[PDB]
Amino acid sequence: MTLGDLWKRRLNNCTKEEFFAYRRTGILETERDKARELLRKGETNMGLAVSRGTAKLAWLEERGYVNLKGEVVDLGCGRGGWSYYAASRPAVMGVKAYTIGGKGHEAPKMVTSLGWNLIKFRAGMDVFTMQPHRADTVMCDIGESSPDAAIEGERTRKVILLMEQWKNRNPSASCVFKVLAPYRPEVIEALHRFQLQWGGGLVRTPFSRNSTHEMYYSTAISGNIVNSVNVQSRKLLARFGDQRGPIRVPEMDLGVGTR
Numbered sequence: 189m190t191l192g193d194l195w196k197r198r199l200n201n202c203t204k205e206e207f208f209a210y211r212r213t214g215i216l217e218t219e220r221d222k223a224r225e226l227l228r229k230g231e232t233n234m235g236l237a238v239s240r241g242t243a244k245l246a247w248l249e250e251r252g253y254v255n256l257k258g259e260v261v262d263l264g265c266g267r268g269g270w271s272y273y274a275a276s277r278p279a280v281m282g283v284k285a286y287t288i289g290g291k292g293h294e295a296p297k298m299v300t301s302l303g304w305n306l307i308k309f310r311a312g313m314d315v316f317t318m319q320p321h322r323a324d325t326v327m328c329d330i331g332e333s334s335p336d337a338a339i340e341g342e343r344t345r346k347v348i349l350l351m352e353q354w355k356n357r358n359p360s361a362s363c364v365f366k367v368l369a370p371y372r373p374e375v376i377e378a379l380h381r382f383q384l385q386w387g388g389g390l391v392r393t394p395f396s397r398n399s400t401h402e403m404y405y406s407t408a409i410s411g412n413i414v415n416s417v418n419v420q421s422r423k424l425l426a427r428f429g430d431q432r433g434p435i436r437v438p439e440m441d442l443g444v445g446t447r
């Protein structure tokens with residue numbers, strides 16, 4: 189049993205009020221008041237982020253932890269926050285975005301955010317059985333939360349295997365992907381093998397809530413994986429009891445227009 193396993197158990201044991209306060213203590217949170225209503229009413233001429241994912245990927249790019257370029261593939265695009273971010277980057281020439289959709293899953297939001305015309309969305313697509321194709325940048329933000337850490341570990345393992353398949357097709361592609369449950373043993377083993385062959389490392393974004401252990405793997409960074417995970421598990425375990433609120437910041441606005 190790992191520190192992350194203990195964190196998950198302590199999380200599940202919170203009362204409702206305890207969980208709510210812990211979830212957001214000390215986290216950066218974009219102000220989505222305007223964006224949320226525009227999307228709800230069906231406004232398409234908007235550059236405000238379609239989800240909280242946009243600011244997360246922007247942070248990784250602005251830190252130099254990812255370098256989005258060329259032909260990008262967004263595996264599990266959901267509402268499209270990462271696809272719209274990538275399409276706005278001058279170094280990106282095209283985005284192919286795929287998501288399963290259906291009951292309980294978010295379909296792409298359709299807006300004129302800058303570079304929208306460079307995105308090809310395909311909903312109703314399972315990426316785990318889809319054959320890889322050529323790409324310069326492979327992104328994947330898949331990892332559905334579950335109160336069961338063993339399920340979260342298996343979900344994470346499937347994402348890492350997907351990334352190995354895309355790297356097999358594209359050995360030189362840059363990769364950025366969510367690692368939902370990085371502390372599980374089969375996840376450590378799989379990440380170690382990934383890092384051995386492809387380089388990379390893990391990083392925690394400041395927008396990720398304390399109710400998730402998610403870390404992002406990128407081929408553009410480095411770092412001992414076990415040390416990265418345990419550092420994160422301890423920061424999460426130490427935040428239990430903190431009463432400070434979230435840190436509110438403006439939502440990303442990418443502007444509108446074609447590229």
Ligand SMILES: Nc1nc2c(ncn2[C@@H]2O[C@H](COP(=O)(O)OP(=O)(O)OP(=O)(O)O)[C@@H](O)[C@H]2O)c(=O)[nH]1
Nearest residue numbers: 199200201202203204207332333334335336399400
């Ligand atoms: N103690 C407690 N734990 C909870 C509760 N709800 C969720 N959790 C735990 O927190 C984990 C993450 O919960 P969520 O924040 O809803 O997961 P998410 O993927 O971010 O969900 P979205 O907000 O829809 O994006 C769950 O897998 C549970 O382990 C709750 O009401 N009480």
Ligand SMILES: C[S@@+](CC[C@H](N)C(=O)[O-])C[C@H]1O[C@@H](n2cnc3c(N)ncnc32)[C@H](O)[C@@H]1O
Nearest residue numbers: 239241264266268269270287288293314315329
């Ligand atoms: C919420 S999204 C990522 C958020 C996105 N990066 C953004 O910025 O809006 C994760 C998506 O992956 C989708 N997904 C999960 N499993 C999938 C699968 N096997 N194939 C395709 N899409 C999948 C889920 O429906 C979900 O919408």
Ligand SMILES: [Mg+2]
Nearest residue numbers: 332333400402
């Ligand atoms: Mg989660």
